[PDB]
Amino acid sequence: DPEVTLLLQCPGGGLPQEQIQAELSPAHDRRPLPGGDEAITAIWETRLKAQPWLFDAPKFRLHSATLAPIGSRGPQLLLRLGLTSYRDFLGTNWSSSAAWLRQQGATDWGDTQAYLADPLGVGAALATADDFLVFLRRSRQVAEAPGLVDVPGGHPEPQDLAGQLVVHELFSSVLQEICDEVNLPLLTLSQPLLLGIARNETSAGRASAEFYVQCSLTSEQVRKHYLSGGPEAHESTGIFFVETQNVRRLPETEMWAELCPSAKGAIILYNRVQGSPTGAALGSPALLPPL
Template sequence: MAHIVKFQPCPRPPPPDVSESSAMDPDISVELQIPSPAELTQEHVRAELAPAYNRQPLLGQEARIAETWEERRRQQPWLFDGAKFRFHSAELRAGRLLLRLGLTSYRDYLGTNWSVQAPALRRQGLADWGDSQAYLAEPLGVGAVLCTADDRFVFLRRSDRVAEASGLLDIPGGHPEPKAAAGDVPEESIRLEHLSAELVVRELFASVLGEIRDEVNIPLDSLSRPMLLGIVRNNRSAGRASAEFYVRCRLTSEEVRQRYLIGGPEAQESTNIVFISRQDVLALEEGASRWQELCPSAKGGVKLYSLVHTELG
């Protein structure tokens, strides 16, 4: 099992400097850019798990989270809670990446990052801890900039059954799941001491392929190994972080379309599939109408891809 780091909560390190071009859209901010994604393999990534990286408790907050969850469940009864990895910070040094992670849940995400009180929680976190995210759930997401064999990039139109960004274009994605790294421990009982840091990293890379399989219905053996492009924050959900990957598919866009129409386990999350050429993807930011059709996670993936695409070959 993992060695759990124990120390007092500390302020979040400032994000590394990125190019000025990364500050173009208020919906997203680049937390971390990998300069050479092809050289940063899964073996160069390490997870540090610590109680200090969990969300900090705040008087009265738990009751508000419970009320928010019950209200959302009344509106969208198909929603379900689940354990998630909480992103605290990341550090890239000498070609190796350190991810500092705690635990959180989807329920807590809707009750903090996605609540109307999120701006106040961020101000309070900054005042109390020197960290605007201290009182937020901050579940780490994953997204895939997915390119077909005929150089078309895959986007999905989000359905109205999803909890956020319905109707917008997204890239395949979701969350790495602690239950995949916790063995036989029931999900509601998972604690940091149940997790292996090595298995957490493995799940991070495996989860993005699993999301492509489940949302687009593409077999895993048709997908390349994921290359981590970096980490982007979604400013529409109070700075929630997502790890964005580049993945090649051995199928053509028409073959992918046919697989998508058959439907996968998570087909209900989208209503349509859209293909955009590589040239047009690189120009998306310049076209205001199509760019504004993208949800923040898709904007983040496209932004990181545009910053490093020459390194990918």
């Protein structure tokens, strides 16, 4: 699967909010472009003169994420975060010249991402009370991944001592994105666990935090809530459900070719971190069928 690479696989079935540290520092920002950030300003002007209703917004930037030695006490993950914007994204990762910026970054900084906005996404493996995962169909008229299958999520907007507020906003934002798009009450949702981080190589390597969230509603109740919002209550054009039993082999299905890279990330990390049992009981042949 060349369009998705794993940057991080979390231990212990995934990490809760209280085991994660963030360092938010201008040392983690994008470097100025070799010929100057004028090239980003020019792309943005051009775009606004065709779509003057467009607006900029701040975004978290992912620099790096370091996992502690496995089995250790205390904080298990450090996220190194800077700040970027939707505009910087359109001028770098989304640019036709994005691969040239990656080569220049390797040459100048020994870092393929040095000249890339790399806004941090969030996504969810969202499971129902009757053991299905939730999928969404993207409109065929949007710019990115048109007509492809997605999972719930988005790109959160800002606002360990500013760090703990930043971790809270990341965990908060994946629940908020589930409530906005799927139309579920917040009180039907578990506290998220971080499964890992996945990079979209089709979008010059921008990364998404992938989370596990459990809903106390069944697939049929989830569908009712989604539909009862009406066409204007969601950006997706449909919802559907796959048994967690069948998610195990989704990479061998015809569905796999229709999944956008960030949704492939969420499913690979779900299969490695929440799937793949380690113990004698869940590992027995009758409960873990071979092939």
